[PDB]
Amino acid sequence: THNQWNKPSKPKTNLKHVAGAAAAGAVVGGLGGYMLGSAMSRPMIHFGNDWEDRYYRENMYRYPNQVYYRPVDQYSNQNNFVHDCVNITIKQHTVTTTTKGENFTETDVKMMERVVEQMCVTQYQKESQAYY
Amino acid sequence: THNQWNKPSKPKTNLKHVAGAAAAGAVVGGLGGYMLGSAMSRPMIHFGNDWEDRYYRENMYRYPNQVYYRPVDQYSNQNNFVHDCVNITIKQHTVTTTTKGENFTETDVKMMERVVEQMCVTQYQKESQAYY
Amino acid sequence: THNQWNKPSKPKTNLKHVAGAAAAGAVVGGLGGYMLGSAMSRPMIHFGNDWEDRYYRENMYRYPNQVYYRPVDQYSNQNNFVHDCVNITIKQHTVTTTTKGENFTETDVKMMERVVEQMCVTQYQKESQAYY
């Protein structure tokens, strides 16, 4: 006789963001930036009744991977990448307070002429010759 | 006779961000940046009843990986990368307070002429020759 | 007779950020930056009942990894990388207070002419010749 009696009370099980290869917010590029043979995930959760006998499972597995970066004649002049050019600030600030003033003049002058030429300029070639 | 009796009360099980290869927010590049044969994760959780007998499982596993970086004729002139050009500040600041003033003049002057030529400039070649 | 009786009360089990290869926020590049044969993780948690007999499992494993960096004719002129050019500040600052003042003049002059030429400039070649 085999008797299995199961009564789990208010279980909570949460799986979030389970993947073989996870690249949710990845930024990839640049002549073969990311190479991956294979990726596998197998989370297992057991909290019931389990009874097994005389079985034969999951035998003789092979996972052969070859990941080759093997170009023959590769010429790259400019290869670049940047993530962020962030929080760049230029200001002229004045705060003036006069609780009480009788006979006065206030002058506030601000000039910005040629403050910057290049601020966030990543890749360029100027007056340059390349021969192949 | 076999008896399995299971009554787990209010269990909480949380799996989050389980992957074989995790590159969620990765930045990758640059002529074969990231090379991975294989990546595997098998997290296992057991808090029930488990009973097993006369079994034969998970035998004879092979995980052969070859990761070769073998380019033959590779010419790279400029290869670069930067994460962030962040929090760059230029300012001219004045705070002025007068609580009481009779017969006075105030003059605030601020100039910015040519403060910066290049602020965040990553890769460039100027008046340069390359021969191949 | 086999009796298994299981009554775990309010267990909490948390797995977060479990991976074979973890590169969540990595920055990678540069002509074969990161090379890895294989990476595996198998975390296991047991707090139930577990009864096993006469079994044969997980035998005869092989994990052969070859990770070869072997370019034949590699020419790299400029290879570079920077993380951050952060928190760069140039400022001219004045705080003035006069609680009480009768007969006075205040002048405040700020100039920035040519403060910086290159602030965060990583890679460049200027008036340079390369022969191959």
Residue numbers in the entry:
A (entry chain B), B (entry chain A), C (entry chain C): 94 to 225
The authors write:
Prions are lethal infectious agents that cause fatal neurodegenerative diseases in mammals, including scrapie in sheep and goats, chronic wasting disease in cervids, bovine spongiform encephalopathy (BSE) in cattle and Creutzfeldt-Jakob disease (CJD) in humans. They are devoid of nucleic acid and composed principally or entirely of multichain fibrillar assemblies of misfolded, host-encoded prion protein (PrP), a glycosylphosphatidylinositol (GPI)-anchored cell surface glycoprotein containing two asparagine (N)-linked glycosylation sites. Prions propagate by means of seeded protein polymerization, which involves recruitment of PrP monomers to fibrillar assemblies followed by fragmentation of these elongating structures to generate more seeds. Different prion strains produce distinct clinicopathological phenotypes in the same inbred host and appear to be encoded by distinct misfolded PrP conformations and assembly states.
In this study, we present a 2.7 Å cryo-EM structure of PrP fibrils present in preparations of infectious RML mouse-adapted scrapie prions, the most commonly studied laboratory prion strain, purified to extremely high specific infectivity. In vitreous ice, we found that infectious prion rods are predominantly single-protofilament helical amyloid fibrils. We determined a 2.7 Å structure of the single RML protofilament and de novo built and refined an atomic model in the cryo-EM density based on mouse PrP sequence (residues T94-Y225). The amyloid core has overall dimensions of approx. 10 × 7 nm and can be divided into a double-hairpin N-terminal lobe and a single-hairpin C-terminal disulphide-stapled lobe. Considering longitudinal stacking of PrP monomers, the N- and C-terminal lobes of the chain are staggered along the amyloid fibril axis, so that each N-terminal lobe is co-planar with the C-terminal lobe of the consecutive rung. Hydrophobic interactions between the N-terminal lobe’s V120 and the C-terminal lobe’s F174 and H176 mediate the contact between the staggered lobes. The other major inter-molecular interactions are the typical hydrogen bonds in the PIRIBS arrangement. Our model suggests that there are 15 inter-chain β-sheets in the RML fibril. The C-terminal lobe of the RML protofilament continues to bind along the opposing strand in the hairpin structure, resulting in the C-terminal lobe being a single hairpin, while in the 263K fibril the chain pivots at residue Y218 to swing in the opposite direction and fold back on itself, forming a double hairpin structure. Comparison of the cross sections of wild-type RML and aRML protofilaments show they are remarkably similar with the exception that residues 226–230 that are disordered in the wild-type RML fibril, presumably due to the presence of the GPI-anchor, are ordered in the aRML fibril.
